[PDB]
Amino acid sequence: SHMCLVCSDEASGCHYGVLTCGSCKVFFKRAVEGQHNYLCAGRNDCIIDKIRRKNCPACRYRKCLQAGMNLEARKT
Amino acid sequence: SHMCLVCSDEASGCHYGVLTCGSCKVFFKRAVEGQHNYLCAGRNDCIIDKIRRKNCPACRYRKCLQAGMNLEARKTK
DNA sequence: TAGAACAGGGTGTTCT
DNA sequence: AAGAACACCCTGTTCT
Ligand SMILES: [Zn+2]
Ligand SMILES: [Zn+2]
Ligand SMILES: [Zn+2]
Ligand SMILES: [Zn+2]
To answer: What's the rounded Cα separation, in Å, for the pair A66 and A10?
Structure first.
């Protein structure tokens, strides 16, 4: 009951390999299967917090990936 | 000139005083008539264009004001 | 944990 | 022009 590793909201467990909130869990699944090519409108370093995480899915997705989120994580 | 001065998409006319596209017309009306408590996740200079204008309402609204958008542009002869 | 599904919000086009 | 309104999409929650 701590804090999302992606946005620093309240984490609701470990999803796809990483301690993340529920909003980040579902955002990640959607980004991976939708195959979206997001583009940042700043510098590829946007603030991803509870308030701003929706602004830049490019940087949010990148953070997910860099925290090591992965769909075949449980299979491991 | 026929490009939107807020996002560079194709402008459809002069709205609220400024050459803009229909999306920036209604975005601006919505932002002025309501709350626009928006937060930039970058450094307040996000690139606002057709493909990214959705990412940052803080910056898209600053750009509208900066271009001179105002609701009473019409009644302002 | 993982996913469907719903419900709310923002967007951008049509307005036979 | 200006504005209503509709469909679409994205997000985040509740439920399984
Ligand atoms: Zn999160
Ligand atoms: Zn970004
Ligand atoms: Zn525009
Ligand atoms: Zn911004």
So the answer is: 19
Q: Which of A48, A55, A63 to mutate to test the interface with B (most CBs of B within 10 A)?
A: A55
Q: What are phi and psi of A18, to 5 degrees?
A: -145, 140
Contacts of B18 (CB under 8 A, 6+ apart): B5, B6, B64, B67, B68, B69, B73
Distance A23 CA to ligand 3 centre (A): 30
Ligand nearest, relative to CA of residue B60: 4
The approach used to solve this structure was: X-ray
Asked if the Cβ of residue B74 lies within 7 A of any atom of strand C, the reply is no
Q: Which domains, ranges and CATH numbers included, belong to chain B?
A: 1-77 (3.30.50.10)
Q: Tell me, what DSSP letter sits at residue B71?
A: G
Instruction: State how far the Cα of B58 lies from the Cα of B6, in Å rounded to an integer.
Output: 12
B30 touches strand C (CB under 7 A): yes
